[PDB]
């Protein structure tokens with residue numbers, strides 16, 4: 001929700017910096033000589049970058065060595081090798097130079113796995129990258145630079161994971177409203193601090209738009225650029241929302257609406273009004289009928305959750321989930337004097353607004 | 365238990381614990397190069413039609429290289 005709080009930057013500027021220098025005088029001639037003996041060789045740049053330059057598909061050693069004296073067994077062989085440059089050019093035309101993810105034509109799986117293994121990185125980081133190449137591909141960029149002299153060059157920006165194996169936790173939130181018989185008069189409250197949280201260098205890297213995180217098994221792949229770096233005291237909002245150490249983000253409304261959030265090991269159900277909220281098993285049928293308010297059901301046994309007319313599927317991931325019973329926070333708030341429109345607020349922004357509005361009543 | 369979960373009835377929220385990071389901190393840049401050649405019978409017209417495809421491709425990349433690109437910005 002708090003995605004509007006995120007800062008902005010250029011993700012391509014890192015790889016474009018290598019592209020802008022690739023147009024510098026001898027630059028083109030430097031890599032040409034180094035890649036004559038072997039197809040893969042480490043190159044030092046004028047700007048001073050440790051760049052792994054790789055010569056993939058040699059058209060000069062095929063056109064001048066097998067098609068030059070003539071100008072069906074050789075046309076099909078040429079078609080096959082020419083196809084890769086025909087698809088790379090097709091991609092750079094519609095994507096205006098920058099392409100993401102990096103296609104198989106741009107870099108093959110055998111080439112990518114070898115490119116990861118040739119990097120001067122940790123033995124641990126290599127395996128993580130190799131086992132999740134599909135995620136690495138998705139995270140990577142490919143920028144067009146120069147064609148200059150008898151060699152086509154394009155910069156491939158791969159991701160680096162400085163933070164690895166540290167704990168992560170997904171926070172799911174849903175609206176908490178009062179459940180009275182009346183048409184209106186219902187006050188609501190939703191925790192806006194929903195998203196992915198990863199412990200990182202004394203702080204907590206928080207990803208408010210959890211959609212920007214890829215999860216393979218336990219591994220949470222996120223981009224720091226999509227994070228806000230928050231103090232460890234942020235986790236206090238889960239155990240004590242009224243803690244003085246941290247001002248817990250919340251949004252207030254009167255929008256008494258039924259919905260369901262499908263968590264990792266179950267589902268939260270915000271059931272309001274005349275809504276049919278139900279948890280069901282594939283065989284047995286309806287195993288739970290949700291009463292008005294905010295409840296939750298574990299994935300163990302339950303296969304589906306239906307709220308009104310929208311059926312949701314529970315995640316069948318193995319794991320133990322604990323129901324922490326407690327009085328719903330919204331009961332403590334007085335329906336009159338409550339600020340029912342705070343779209344982006346906090347526990348204090350509300351308590352201060354109440355303290356202020358109560359003072360006008362007391363003096364009169 | 366590898367993965368765990370906690371549901372707070374008081375705040376209408378749930379926390380899914382037991383995950384491990386793989387946060388993208390920076391970037392590794394690499395230059396990918398392709399060594400290209402500068403240049404009535406049915407068997408000779410097909411190799412011409414395919415060499416025309418190669419020439420048109422190299423001429424297309426020559427117009428793109430000058431223009432410098434960007435992902436986008438301001439999000």
Ligand SMILES: *[C@@H]1O[C@H](CO)[C@@H](O)[C@H](O)[C@H]1NC(C)=O
Pocket residue numbers: 351355
């Ligand atoms: C303002 O709220 C605080 C609690 O957050 C309370 O201690 C204080 O007494 C209130 N102010 C007044 C004037 O009562």
